[PDB]
């Protein structure tokens, strides 16, 4: 919530891989095998489809006038539901369950963008077509 | 009941070291690839060593694989742990060989022998999208920095049905703290759902095809594509589907009396004319057209070049003329007398054509495919009547599959190609309704010039009223056999491949250079026609089943050219 | 137990033509693993009177006892056959067919319920191959106890129900599915529509089909079903067996066949109030059987049936003679153009009211196997049925390409249509543009004889063809553009075969061909009543407006209007020829200028 920065990674090259004697190989989209879901991969390809930069929320901030304790919920999927019921630490021990409002300023957003990477022309096999894959980027 | 079966499989593996050295080779290949930094952990078991070694174990595998397959894979995992001595996953099995009565057609596959393993061959119609599934999900607690994990089971991970445990995905901790989804330490196993029906040559053609569904694991997801003949081996489980563990991608009987008859009819030089005249006695005339139809249904050679593209062996025939004759009556004869043939009307296909139909789904995986008509017949013949009514989409499709014999489909999920080495028989009608010699021979077809270049032989049948020739048609229609030419055509297709000689190269070079005359007088001659001028020769040379070609084959091809061009 | 020994003695002791018929059939079915056998009711009534009457009275309690005796002898057959060369045996379902009686659907009453019943009809629907169980392992979720339950012949208040208790409370049971399932079908059957009263539509019946006879019956044929008339009030049929396809009458038919003016009185009898039209009446009465069906040894057989088409103003029995051909003929059903009210001529597909099953609603083109079809209002045809009737009128085969089933079927139908791109299907696909004793003679003639033709009467046909081709060529080279084919000559041959077949003779003479040419001349009189057009069109496009803009249906309307050669049919005919000759410029103009208009 108080993250001023954005954390990102980058892999090692082949020159640092031959030195001291893999993790970063140029992978095709036909060379994905299914079982690489969760490994860091370096894919090479042309980009045909790109989208506009859009703000996607990460955490939804709700404010109340009755208690003052602003709550924050975390979303993970593409969609979500509005938490109209109060889950604060003061409304649990109370008969009243007063209305909550949303804040578009205290909520943390991210510059989300989808892209379609395509398979390289000479890396595709004989007869096959260059199928695509989706890349979801965020931040800077 | 588990210990006795695991010691019997250990004794069978100690007797036969062919699987032990194979799994040691699997492990040393994995170690060499790990040292450089994979194979999908399965060993095919020859069933012929299981019948003579143990009869009861063989019978138990054939009647109860749910109680016989997991102790054998437990023995295989124990052998993989005992054969390896380095530090630090399951292992599966596979079978092959003859099955007897268990090997059957899917149309004859009924409610009997459920639990028993079924070997069934056929043609695949659809191959769904590859979908990953969760069998284990991990999570992290940031309040203390711990890691938690949960496992998932279903009715497709074991042969026996386990007690159903509907494990809810953890959106909360047991203490009540927040948590996140550790994407990456949780394994993913992909599955596929393919459909397979019976082959059109072995099935009693006239009926409906019956298809079945195969659920596929991670290992064998890259070896399936539509349009190929396949043989699957699985278990007919009914929660009705088959749990396919072994896939192998891959007709009149001949006696010794019929081979004497076709060897006796191989050296007489009057065989071709009477064999061309004996195919349809209900149709008067048109001898050279059925001579080309005889050369058409027997085939070519299908030459595959070294390190390059393949060469077309198939021939294509287009037939035009007035609609009074038997062009629509010849398709029924060529459909009922060939080895395998598919006939379509040319207009009325529910998909986008006779290839790459509609794609939609309503089940769990929201992707499904469909097979067309040209992707089913891979070596036979297809017949399209009313060629002028066929739209441009199928015309673009047959422009591409004519001399390349491959079809490429760029869908949202499917980006593969498949073989279409078939021969087309097109029958068309003019747009004016009638045609005579005094009209020009180019605008009467009302087809583009590229389609005239795609089709090899264009046969024009005239029907102007003439009192001399029209006197005997009434008494002829008012007035060698069928099971012999089928055996003749398939024995020529399977045994003899003809090669070229110097006696038949020069005469076809002379004929091609003499016609390249027709360009100034009546018809365009292309480079593709060079190829079609020797295909037919080879044809005639294999009609006589000689090991090489002759000069008379090029002469009868030039005679067929003079009849179909002038 | 005594009935067990009696049925085992009936299986291993019945003799016919000095051989057992059930032992070798059981060995052949066990060797291919079919798990079924064909028994006949006539053999068991000829063998034992203590079996058939008890089977007819109480089949539900004696039939699974016979079934378990069949499995008891099958186990012995399997263990003695497996030991010769190269465990778990299911309950062998028996099928049993007979032809001792054929009761109609209207004779079904409140009596003889749950007894044996055999009747004929037309299967309209085989909807969903559903699943049931035959042996299932059940377990509990509380005290970790499991067991199993078996059923053999009982496949809404019946036999199969889960136990409420084995404390675990109500329903603690879980089905262990992979250690356990059979197929079954729900079918619909209706009575023959040729014999159904005019005041009410034909009723139907529902039936349950099990394991060994699944997917054996295509919907739309003459099917004889034998089973149990049970009650679920509503009746239903449990199928246990399946099969399919007065001397004074023949004396008076032979006396009527000796009359020389028979054709003439037949024609004076088919038209009681129709004034005139003898050539239409003879062509209607000669288009029933068709022609000479000949099975050549090369496999390319010839079609025997023909086509007849009525055309004219409303009235003059265009739909009244069709009722007489619906009630006279062996197999025929009355329908109309684009189907009818809650019925269809072609393959009509609808939705099921229960469980949303996609299934075919009905069809009269499958139900007319081996006869004629008769429709009204030929101008009102849908595009999804026109291609099917377009192929069936010349090839007599109906091909379906659905994802569930892809069946081609022998239609074997002739058409007797009435009416008021359509020009080629009217002028090319059509060749012509007591009562119980008569129907019996028509059926005996359609099954018994296979005629031929003599060359002495065929030379007149050859001379007629030479003269009509030499005479209509004057009208055809004069750019009238209306024809003459060999298909019409083959239809003339089929007409002569039908006319020579009506006197029950295998030979033909000049007596039938002199009436056949007179029948054909009225059709030719009704049918009778490119350089220039392409010079016009092509020169127009080419040298007038290459963009084509400003030159469309207006401008041709002007030129041709001002050249006095335009007929809209002629205009659109030359044009469709140009798009169709793939003038791809004519393609292009059609795409634009056409509904761009000018």
Swiss-Prot record, chain A:
Subcellular location: Cytoplasm; Nucleus
The organism's place on the tree of life at top rank: Eukaryota
General function of this protein: Acts as a component of the MCM2-7 complex (MCM complex) which is the putative replicative helicase essential for 'once per cell cycle' DNA replication initiation and elongation in eukaryotic cells. Core component of CDC45-MCM-GINS (CMG) helicase, the molecular machine that unwinds template DNA during replication, and around which the replisome is built.
Note: Present with 166 molecules/cell in log phase SD medium. Early fractionation of eukaryotic MCM proteins yielded a variety of dimeric, trimeric and tetrameric complexes with unclear biological significance. Specifically a MCM467 subcomplex is shown to have in vitro helicase activity which is inhibited by the MCM2 subunit. The MCM2-7 hexamer is the proposed physiological active complex.
Subunit structure: Component of the MCM2-7 complex. The complex forms a toroidal hexameric ring with the proposed subunit order MCM2-MCM6-MCM4-MCM7-MCM3-MCM5; loaded onto DNA, forms a head-head double hexamer. Interacts with CSM1 and MCM10.
Membership in a protein family: Belongs to the MCM family.
Protein name per UniProt: DNA replication licensing factor MCM7
Organism annotation: Saccharomyces cerevisiae (strain ATCC 204508 / S288c)
Upper taxonomic lineage: Eukaryota, Fungi, Dikarya, Ascomycota, Saccharomycotina
Curated annotation (Swiss-Prot), chain B:
Single GO term (MF): DNA replication origin binding
Alphabetical keyword list: ATP-binding, DNA replication, DNA-binding, Helicase, Hydrolase, Nucleotide-binding, Nucleus, Phosphoprotein
UniProt keyword DNA-binding, yes or no: yes
Ranges spanned by the short sequence motif Arginine finger, renumbered to the chain: 453-456
Major localization class: nucleus
Keyword DNA-binding among record annotations: yes
Occurrences of domain MCM (ranges): 271-478
Record EC number: 3.6.4.12
Binding site for ATP: 321-328
Tree of life domain: Eukaryota
Subcellular localization: Nucleus
A Gene Ontology BP annotation from the UniProt entry: DNA strand elongation involved in DNA replication
UniProt catalytic activity: ATP + H2O = ADP + phosphate + H(+)
Subunit-structure text: Component of the MCM2-7 complex. The complex forms a toroidal hexameric ring with the proposed subunit order MCM2-MCM6-MCM4-MCM7-MCM3-MCM5; loaded onto DNA, forms a head-head double hexamer. Interacts with CSM1.
Role summary: Acts as a component of the MCM2-7 complex (MCM complex) which is the putative replicative helicase essential for 'once per cell cycle' DNA replication initiation and elongation in eukaryotic cells. The active ATPase sites in the MCM2-7 ring are formed through the interaction surfaces of two neighboring subunits such that a critical structure of a conserved arginine finger motif is provided in trans relative to the ATP-binding site of the Walker A box of the adjacent subunit. The six ATPase active sites, however, are likely to contribute differentially to the complex helicase activity.
Note: Present with 35100 molecules/cell in log phase SD medium. Early fractionation of eukaryotic MCM proteins yielded a variety of dimeric, trimeric and tetrameric complexes with unclear biological significance. The MCM2-7 hexamer is the proposed physiological active complex.
Protein name: DNA replication licensing factor MCM3
Organism: Saccharomyces cerevisiae (strain ATCC 204508 / S288c) (Baker's yeast)
Gene transcribed to yield this protein: MCM3
Residues of the full protein shown: 20 to 738 of 971
Curated annotation (Swiss-Prot), chain C:
Residues reported to bind ATP: 312-319
Listed EC numbers: 3.6.4.12
Annotated catalysed reactions: ATP + H2O = ADP + phosphate + H(+)
InterPro entries xrefs: MCM, MCM5, MCM5_C, MCM_CS, MCM_dom, MCM_lid, MCM_N, MCM_OB
Biological process according to GO: DNA replication initiation; double-strand break repair via break-induced replication; heterochromatin formation; nuclear DNA replication; pre-replicative complex assembly involved in nuclear cell cycle DNA replication; premeiotic DNA replication; regulation of DNA-templated DNA replication initiation; subtelomeric heterochromatin formation
Motif Arginine finger, chain ranges: 428-431
GO cellular component: chromosome, telomeric region; CMG complex; cytoplasm; DNA replication preinitiation complex; MCM complex; nuclear pre-replicative complex; nuclear replication fork; nucleoplasm
Keyword 4Fe-4S listed: no
Lineage: superkingdom: Eukaryota
Subcellular location as annotated: Nucleus
MCM domain segment(s): 262-433
Enzyme class: hydrolase
Keyword list, A-Z: ATP-binding, Cell cycle, DNA replication, DNA-binding, Helicase, Hydrolase, Nucleotide-binding, Nucleus
A single MF term (Gene Ontology): chromatin binding
SMART domains tied to this protein: MCM (SM00350)
Family: Belongs to the MCM family.
Note: Present with 10300 molecules/cell in log phase SD medium. Early fractionation of eukaryotic MCM proteins yielded a variety of dimeric, trimeric and tetrameric complexes with unclear biological significance. The MCM2-7 hexamer is the proposed physiological active complex.
Role according to the record: Acts as a component of the MCM2-7 complex (MCM complex) which is the putative replicative helicase essential for 'once per cell cycle' DNA replication initiation and elongation in eukaryotic cells. The active ATPase sites in the MCM2-7 ring are formed through the interaction surfaces of two neighboring subunits such that a critical structure of a conserved arginine finger motif is provided in trans relative to the ATP-binding site of the Walker A box of the adjacent subunit.
Descriptive protein name: Minichromosome maintenance protein 5
């Amino acid at each position: 919530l108080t993250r001023r920065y954005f954390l990102y990674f980058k892999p090692l090259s082949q020159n640092c891989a031959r030195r001291y004697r893999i993790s970063s190989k140029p992978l095709s989209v036909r060379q994905i095998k299914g079982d690489f879901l969760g490994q860091l991969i370096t894919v090479r390809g042309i980009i045909t489809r790109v989208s506009d930069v859009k703000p996607a929320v990460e955490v939804i901030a709700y404010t109340c006038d009755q208690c003052g304790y602003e709550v924050f919920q975390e979303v993970n999927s593409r969609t979500f539901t509005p938490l109209s019921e109060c889950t604060s630490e003061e409304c649990s021990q109370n008969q009243t369950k007063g209305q909550l409002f949303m804040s578009t300023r205290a909520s943390k957003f991210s510059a989300f963008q989808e892209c379609k990477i395509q398979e390289l022309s000479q890396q595709v096999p004989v007869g096959h077509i260059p199928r695509s894959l989706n890349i979801h980027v965020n931040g800077t | 009941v588990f210990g006795d079966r695991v010691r019997r499989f250990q004794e069978f593996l100690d007797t036969f070291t062919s699987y032990r050295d194979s799994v040691r080779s699997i492990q040393v290949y994995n170690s060499n690839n790990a040292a450089n930094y994979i194979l999908p952990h399965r060993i095919i078991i020859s069933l012929d060593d299981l019948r003579e070694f143990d009869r009861s174990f063989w019978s138990g595998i054939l009647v109860e694989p749910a109680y016989f397959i997991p102790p054998a894979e437990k023995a295989l995992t124990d052998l993989a742990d005992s054969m390896d001595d380095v530090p630090h996953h399951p292992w599966k099995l596979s079978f092959k060989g003859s099955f007897g009565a268990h090997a059957l057609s899917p149309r004859t596959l009924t409610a009997q022998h459920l639990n028993k393993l079924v070997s069934v061959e056929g043609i695949v119609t659809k191959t769904s999208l590859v979908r990953p599934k969760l069998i284990r999900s991990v999570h992290y607690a940031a309040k203390t920095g711990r890691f938690h994990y949960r496992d998932y089971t279903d009715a497709t991970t074991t042969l026996t049905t386990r007690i159903p445990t509907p494990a809810i995905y953890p959106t909360e901790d047991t203490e009540g703290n927040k948590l996140t989804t550790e994407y990456g330490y949780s394994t993913f196993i992909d599955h596929q759902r393919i459909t397979v029906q019976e082959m059109p040559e072995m099935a009693p053609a006239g009926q409906l095809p019956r298809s079945i569904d195969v659920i596929l694991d991670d290992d064998l997801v890259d070896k399936t594509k539509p349009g190929d003949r396949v043989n699957v081996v699985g278990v007919f489980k009914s929660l009705t589907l088959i749990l396919g563990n072994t896939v192998y991608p891959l007709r009149q009987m001949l006696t010794d009396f019929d081979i004497r008859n076709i060897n006796k009819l191989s050296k007489k030089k009057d065989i071709f004319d009477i064999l061309s005249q004996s195919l349809a006695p209900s149709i008067y005339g048109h001898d050279h057209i059925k001579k080309a139809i005889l050369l058409m249904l027997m085939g070519g050679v299908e030459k595959n070049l070294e390190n390059g593209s393949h060469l077309r062996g198939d021939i294509n025939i287009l037939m035009v003329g007035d609609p009074s004759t038997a062009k629509s009556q010849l398709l029924r004869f060529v459909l009922n007398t060939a080895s395998l043939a598919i006939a379509t009307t040319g207009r009325g296909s529910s998909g986008v054509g006779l290839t790459a139909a509609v794609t939609t789904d309503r089940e769990t995986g929201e992707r499904r495919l469909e097979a067309g008509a040209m992707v089913l017949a891979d070596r036979g013949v297809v017949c399209i009547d009313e060629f002028d009514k066929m739209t441009d989409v199928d015309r673009v499709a047959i422009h591409e599959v004519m001399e390349q014999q491959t079809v490429t489909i760029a869908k949202a999920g499917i980006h593969t190609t498949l073989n279409a080495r078939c021969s087309v028989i097109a029958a068309a009608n003019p747009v004016f309704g009638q045609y005579d010699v005094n009209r020009d021979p180019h605008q009467n077809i009302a087809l583009p010039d590229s389609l005239l270049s795609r089709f090899d032989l264009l046969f024009v049948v005239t029907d102007d009223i003439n009192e001399i020739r029209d006197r005997s048609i009434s008494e002829h229609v008012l007035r060698v056999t069928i099971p012999f030419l089928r055996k003749y055509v398939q024995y020529a297709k399977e045994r003899v491949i003809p090669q070229l000689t110097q006696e038949a190269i020069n005469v076809i070079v002379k004929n091609y250079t003499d016609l390249r005359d027709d360009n100034t007088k009546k018809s365009p001659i292309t480079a593709r026609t060079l190829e079609t001028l020797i295909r037919l020769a080879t044809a005639h040379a294999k009609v006589r089943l000689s090991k090489t070609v002759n000069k008379v084959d090029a002469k009868v091809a030039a005679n067929l050219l003079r009849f179909a061009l002038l | 137990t005594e009935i067990i020994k009696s049925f085992k003695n009936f299986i291993l002791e019945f003799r016919l033509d000095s051989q057992f018929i059930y032992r070798d059939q059981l060995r052949n079915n066990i060797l291919v693993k079919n798990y079924s056998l064909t028994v006949n009711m006539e053999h068991l009534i000829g063998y034992n009177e203590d079996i058939y009457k008890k089977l007819s009275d109480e089949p539900s309690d004696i039939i699974p006892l016979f079934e378990t005796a069949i499995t008891q002898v099958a186990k012995r057959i399997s263990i003695l056959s497996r030991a010769q060369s190269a465990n778990s045996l299911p309950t062998f379902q028996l099928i049993l067919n007979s032809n001792a009686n054929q009761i109609p659907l209207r004779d079904l009453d409140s009596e003889h319920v749950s007894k044996i019943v055999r009747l004929s009809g037309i299967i309209i629907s085989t909807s969903v191959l559903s699943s049931r169980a035959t042996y299932l392992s059940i377990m509990c979720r509380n005290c970790r106890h499991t067991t199993s339950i078996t059923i053999n012949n009982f496949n809404t208040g019946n036999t199969v129900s889960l136990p409420r208790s084995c404390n675990c409370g109500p329903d603690p049971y879980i089905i262990i599915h992979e250690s356990s399932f059979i197929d079954q079908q729900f079918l619909k059957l209706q009575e023959i529509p040729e014999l159904v009263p005019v005041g009410e539509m034909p009723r139907n019946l529902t039936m349950t089909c099990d394991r060994y006879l699944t997917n054996k019956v295509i919907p739309g044929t003459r099917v004889t079903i034998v089973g149990i008339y049970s009650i679920y009030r509503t009746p239903y049929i449990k199928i246990l067996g399946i099969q399919s396809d007065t001397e004074e009458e023949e004396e008076e038919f032979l006396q009527l066949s000796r009359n020389p003016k028979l054709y003439e009185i037949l024609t004076n009898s088919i038209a009681p109030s129709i004034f005139g039209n003898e050539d239409i009446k003879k062509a209607i009465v000669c288009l029933l059987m068709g022609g000479s069906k000949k099975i050549l040894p090369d496999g390319m057989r010839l079609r025997g049936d023909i086509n007849v088409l009525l055309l004219g103003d409303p009235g003059t029995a265009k739909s009244q003679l069709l009722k007489f051909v619906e009630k006279v003929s062996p197999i025929a059903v009355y329908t109309s153009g684009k189907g009818s009210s809650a019925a269809g001529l072609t393959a009509s597909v609808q939705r099921d009211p229960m469980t949303r099953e996609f299934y075919l609603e009905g069809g009269a083109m499958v139900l007319a196997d081996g006869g004629v079809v008769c429709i009204d209002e030929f101008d009102k045809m849908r595009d999804e049925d026109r291609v099917a009737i377009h192929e069936a009128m010349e090839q007599q085969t109906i091909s379906i390409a659905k994802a569930g089933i892809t069946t081609v079927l022998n239609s074997r139908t002739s058409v007797l249509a009435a009416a008021n791109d359509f020009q080629t299907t009217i002028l090319s696909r059509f060749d012509m543009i007591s009562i119980e004793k008569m129907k019996r003679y028509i059926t005996y003639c359609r099954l018994k004889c296979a005629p031929r033709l003599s060359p002495q009467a065929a030379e007149k046909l050859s001379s007629n063809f030479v003269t009509i081709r030499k005479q209509l060529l004057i009208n055809e080279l004069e750019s009238t553009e209306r024809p003459i084919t060999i298909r019409q000559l083959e239809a003339i041959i089929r007409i002569t075969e039908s006319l020579a077949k009506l006197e029950l003779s295998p030979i033909a003479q000049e007596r039938h061909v002199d009436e056949a040419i007179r029948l054909f001349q009225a059709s030719t009189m009704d049918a009778a009543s490119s350089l220039s057009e392409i010079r016009r069109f092509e020169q127009e496009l080419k040298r007038r407006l290459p963009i084509g803009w400003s030159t469309s249906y207006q401008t041709l309307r002007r030129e041709f209007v001002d050249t006095h050669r335009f007929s809209q049919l002629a205009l659109d005919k030359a044009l469709y020829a140009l798009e169709k000759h793939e003038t791809i410029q004519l393609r292009h103009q059609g795409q634009n200028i056409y509904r761009s208009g000018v």
